[PDB]
Design a protein around this ligand. Sequence first.
Ligand SMILES: CC(C)=CCC/C(C)=C/CN[C@@H](CCC(=O)O)C(=O)O
Ligand SMILES: [Mg+2]
Length: 429
Amino acid sequence: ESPKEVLSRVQDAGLTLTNPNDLYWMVDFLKEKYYDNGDYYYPIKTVCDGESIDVKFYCPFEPSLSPHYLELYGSRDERASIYETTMKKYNRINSEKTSAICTPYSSYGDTQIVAYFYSMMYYINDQTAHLKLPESEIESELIDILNDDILIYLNEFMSIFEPEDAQDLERIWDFLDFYQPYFSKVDGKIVLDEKYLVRTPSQMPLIKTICEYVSEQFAPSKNITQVIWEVVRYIKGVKDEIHIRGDKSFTLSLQEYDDFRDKVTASPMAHAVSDLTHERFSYEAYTNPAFMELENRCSEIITYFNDVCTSDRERLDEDPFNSVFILMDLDPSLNFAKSCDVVVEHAYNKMQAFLKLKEEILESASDEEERLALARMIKTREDSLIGYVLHEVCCVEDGYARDHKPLMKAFLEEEITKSLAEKVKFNPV
Ligand SMILES: CC(C)=CCC/C(C)=C/CN[C@@H](CCC(=O)O)C(=O)O
Ligand SMILES: [Mg+2]
């Protein structure tokens, strides 16, 4: 469409997330207003316990939205039929928007597979969130189901894992840790014992859809060990979260929170699959200690940004595992607004640490092939960082985001109206 008809729609109906075209104009506005002006501080306007949360998320990477977002959104009802879900829950997760904005330069299928991975994290997260309830409301049967589900989910990823190198089979086998006694190595594959296939988990169609795509698209020609490795790390992290949330003794320091969030942010799973979509790819990077730290900085930045945006909702859940609340518990002078400022500052320092690791990783490359591979893999993680910022910025319609921001809806509608008018006025120049 033209800026004139979009301006007419915004002046009359405002901005929506139900019309997928609006997101293209929102992301275009954010790039022109911020990135294109050298301003890498994106506004986040929300509330927490009645306190105004008015902060800036720092991210110096180029904003973009996938050209496939229109088709992804147009097929969202078919996609949702895979899930055991209400549409109310599916709409708030909005994996179509997450994948399109964090993975903007991929094919339709390579963008959709990222949506599937992020949706898997959200649905498992909301299943684990049952442990947030008071002790008198916990149902042990739901916890038994959850513990069985993630073990069965893990085996489904094991079932597509047939590495060319036996060293990669040992890498995953040694990484199973407390899950290893449930598995056996059988004909070059890691298999769950038949005793523990006791149910069909509620999101098994989703997990099978993920495994089928990875098996059919990447397993024949690429080394998918890191995809499996990150899934193991995530599933073990969910188990750690169950153990952490199960014991109502919440004793996580900020560093222990970082180490825990390194496992459960799920973006490393999406990066592992996205890495396989590019010819520039170095499997050795995954065991490079500097690259592993770069992935951890990325997960922590997303976590800290998420902690600010989820603060008011998680405060009502009495959920203590949020960097905003951990800092307040350690410092009594902090209210919610001042704590969010500290989290935002920590996120800025992690971003600078990310950029410092990036320069060191690329300088350590031994040849052009490895440099271009590392640079491509780092670029993929940068896409997710700016994508997640814009994801939270553009929560402008209630029901189509985990954390609707009515102050962002008002701010973006006021600002995009002036920007679209400037496009119309100088047209066709
Ligand atoms: C690009 C994406 C999608 C990154 C993952 C975002 C993230 C860090 C999710 C963690 N989930 C939160 C609560 C989110 C919610 O409930 O909406 C938690 O459990 O700490
Ligand atoms: Mg949280």
